[PDB]
Amino acid sequence: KDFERCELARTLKRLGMDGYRGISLANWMCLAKWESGYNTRATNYNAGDRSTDYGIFQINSRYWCNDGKTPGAVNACHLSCSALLQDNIADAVACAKRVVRDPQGIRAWVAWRNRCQNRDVRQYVQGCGV
């Protein structure tokens, strides 16, 4: 599904993302916007290292989930990558939390560095009541 901006902001808040490991909801929103346009079914194949990015946060199969077809990959979220393509984003949120528990934090995603870091992100949650 395609989430509407405020619908997603509330869903993420209910799932405990606001301020998770110091990351504001506005940052998570900006990340989802730029990674998938708030679409849960998005997938991106990286022909270079034979990995695939999955779901609303475009979480990568080399490290985070198992799709059985990425050479020498690991599964740090201990989930089938299929779990990251659900309309219900609970599992995807649990995995994104796992990603940020690592040292890089939100910087793990290059898109965040490109479109969200050192930029005004307040616009992503304005008027959503979060």
Side-chain angles (χ1 to χ4, degrees):
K1 60 172 290 175
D2 276 5
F3 270 86
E4 286 195 61
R5 186 180 64 94
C6 292
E7 174 192 16
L8 176 61
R10 284 191 295 277
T11 299
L12 294 176
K13 189 173 188 181
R14 293 194 312 266
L15 290 169
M17 291 291 253
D18 196 7
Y20 185 83
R21 290 293 152 93
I23 303 160
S24 73
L25 179 58
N27 276 283
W28 287 121
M29 288 298 292
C30 184
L31 173 68
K33 179 64 179 175
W34 291 101
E35 285 299 347
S36 66
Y38 309 145
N39 181 91
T40 63
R41 278 200 53 165
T43 53
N44 176 69
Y45 179 61
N46 304 290
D49 77 326
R50 297 172 142 120
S51 69
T52 300
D53 300 311
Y54 296 85
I56 197 163
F57 295 122
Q58 292 287 277
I59 292 172
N60 193 260
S61 64
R62 172 152 303 283
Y63 311 103
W64 312 105
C65 64
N66 183 48
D67 61 7
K69 58 173 183 189
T70 303
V74 286
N75 181 11
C77 290
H78 298 101
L79 291 176
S80 160
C81 295
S82 169
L84 307 185
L85 297 175
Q86 296 176 83
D87 268 11
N88 186 293
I89 69 171
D91 290 319
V93 160
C95 190
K97 287 179 181 181
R98 172 61 184 93
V99 175
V100 301
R101 286 204 289 278
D102 268 13
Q104 285 189 291
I106 191 72
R107 289 161 162 74
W109 290 266
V110 184
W112 179 85
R113 299 183 229 163
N114 298 345
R115 315 281 178 159
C116 312
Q117 179 178 199
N118 303 151
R119 296 177 185 245
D120 174 42
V121 292
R122 291 175 293 156
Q123 64 184 292
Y124 296 98
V125 294
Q126 295 308 290
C128 304
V130 290

